[PDB]
Amino acid sequence: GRISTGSKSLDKLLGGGIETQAITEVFGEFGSGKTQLAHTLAVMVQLPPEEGGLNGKAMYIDTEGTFRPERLLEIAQNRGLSGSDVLDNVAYARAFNSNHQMLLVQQASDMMVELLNTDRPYKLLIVDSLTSHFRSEYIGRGALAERQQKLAKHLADLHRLANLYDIAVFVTNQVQANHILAHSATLRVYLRKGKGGKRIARLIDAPHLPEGEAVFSITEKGIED
Numbered sequence: 001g002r003i004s005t006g007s008k009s010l011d012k013l014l015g016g017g018i019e020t021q022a023i024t025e026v027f028g029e030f031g032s033g034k035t036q037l038a039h040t041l042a043v044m045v046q047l048p049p050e051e052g053g054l055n056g057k058a059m060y061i062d063t064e065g066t067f068r069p070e071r072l073l074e075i076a077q078n079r080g081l082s083g084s085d086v087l088d089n090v091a092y093a094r095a096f097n098s099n100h101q102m103l104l105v106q107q108a109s110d111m112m113v114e115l116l117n118t119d120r121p122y123k124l125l126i127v128d129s130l131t132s133h134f135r136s137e138y139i140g141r142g143a144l145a146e147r148q149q150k151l152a153k154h155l156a157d158l159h160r161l162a163n164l165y166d167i168a169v170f171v172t173n174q175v176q177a178n179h180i181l182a183h184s185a186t187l188r189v190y191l192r193k194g195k196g197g198k199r200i201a202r203l204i205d206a207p208h209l210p211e212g213e214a215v216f217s218i219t220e221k222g223i224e225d
């Protein structure tokens with residue numbers, strides 16, 4: 001049981017879609033479609049398995065004010081769904097610094113246990129974006145050891161949530177050409193801009209999946225082939 005991205009091409013690259021019990025990271029420049037894929041996943045996860053979802057709820061942690069509840073409505077309506085119910089099934093939190101971002105993962109644990117054995121459990125946790133607060137707050141050579149200690153602890157908490165509660169953790173990371181915030185991820189996907197409103201996804205760290213690329217479009221339905 002995997003969460004469809006909305007793109008048949010990007011799902012085949014991922015072996016069916018985004019996995020639970022894993023952290024799936026997309027990285028790329030600004031504008032490559034990371035936040036759009038996250039918004040689509042927040043909707044897709046609500047669908048029944050036959051339509052590409054997991055009959056679940058989504059949690060969205062927003063570190064840069066990128067969350068657009070209207071965009072969720074747009075995606076839901078164009079896919080034949082109630083924009084109201086789609087919004088009812090997404091838990092949302094704005095993280096204003098890296099300490100708040102870390103506490104939210106701890107608090108997400110409480111929300112997940114509660115729904116764990118119900119009809120619509122949480123199935124997706126989004127962190128958009130994972131690193132930005134760490135880059136901006138840990139300033140100077142004197143702060144780099146603590147920066148990695150906190151980033152490492154934060155990824156350990158996310159891995160633990162994913163395994164405990166059988167949820168997909170989807171994180172976005174803004175890697176620019178051209179400063180390195182190393183961190184663990186189960187799956188890494190590089191996004192870049194393509195021909196017009198197309199985007200290209202490349203598998204970077206994928207243990208046994210065949211390497212390769214996939215093309216997808218940003219449409220009114222979220223992400224599409």
Ligand SMILES: COc1ccc([C@H](C)NC(=O)[C@@H]2CCCN2C(=O)CNC(=O)c2ccc3ccccc3n2)cc1
Binds near residue numbers: 059
């Ligand atoms: C009509 O316009 C809208 C605008 C936005 C929405 C969004 C989608 N819904 C919400 O904001 C809903 C409804 C009001 C409170 N609320 C929450 O989700 C409150 N969330 C939390 O307390 C919380 C706590 C810890 C978390 C840790 C990780 C991730 C998420 C977390 N969320 C709905 C309608």
